[PDB]
Amino acid sequence: VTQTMKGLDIQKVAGTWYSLAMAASDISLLDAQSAPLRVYVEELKPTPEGDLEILLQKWENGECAQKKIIAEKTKIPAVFKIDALNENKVLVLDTDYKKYLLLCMENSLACQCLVRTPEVDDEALEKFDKALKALPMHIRLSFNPTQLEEQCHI
Amino acid sequence: VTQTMKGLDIQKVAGTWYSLAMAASDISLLDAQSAPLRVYVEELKPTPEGDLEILLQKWENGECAQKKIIAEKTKIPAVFKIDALNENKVLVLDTDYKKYLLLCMENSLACQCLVRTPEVDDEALEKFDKALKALPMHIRLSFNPTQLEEQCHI
């Protein structure tokens, strides 16, 4: 991934988001309901000191569960690191703050097109697919407005 | 689907094919290993009287199984009908016979990009994605050359 948002103002991504589309390098990352990177973003919560808290839902043990994970800031504004067994980065590729936000996670690679409202934003999906053609994705999903209004996009 | 191959010569699609990419209208059609339209084409076998026999593999009961299904000809050369509880059509969208073949099945809709050899044919995938932008797909998968040489693309 060699797309990052120049001049990102992280405080301005705060609030409500919808995981409109997802893609990943390996089918197994997204294939099933309980696949490891089948995560549905609810809210982005920047800290005053510039970390990025992410509220999301994930299907685990036959149930739609709440998760809260902290992605810690780095020297680069558009790059955050999640504390785990593995060093994994969260990258903000692009955003206009008010409509769409493109982000990826890598260790191999998964990405999402986030939007502010439960609508199919063709313009944001164009920007997502453009970003992705530089990346070796083998699975891509997208949700309809009804699914976007349901826990775990059921 | 309002893309069919003009002047199709069905006898010339005979032989070996690889399911390089798949897409479908509903995630559930392709999501898991045993999803209903997760089928891997092995061979196309036109009959002398112009029907299209399809040899494929499908994951069923925790196993990669052989299937043979007959798609019967219609008045339209690029449209075939599979005998089931439901009337389902197989449509040949496009082919150059020697490299790629795009086909869909509808009742809602799933499509594949077939290629003759276990290679990622970027040119055929461009033609596949072009065909698909006219269609309401919500899941898309693609296979690497290693997976293409394995039973059920394992």
Ligand SMILES: CCCCCCCCCCCCCC(=O)O
């Ligand atoms: C996949 C790109 C969008 C990034 C979404 C936020 C990153 C968090 C996903 C990592 C897995 C979270 C599940 C957990 O381990 O509790």
Ligand SMILES: CCCCCCCCCCCCCC(=O)O
């Ligand atoms: C999905 C577009 C490619 C068409 C592949 C050939 C169509 C056959 C799939 C229908 C399901 C076959 C499994 C079975 O019912 O035995």
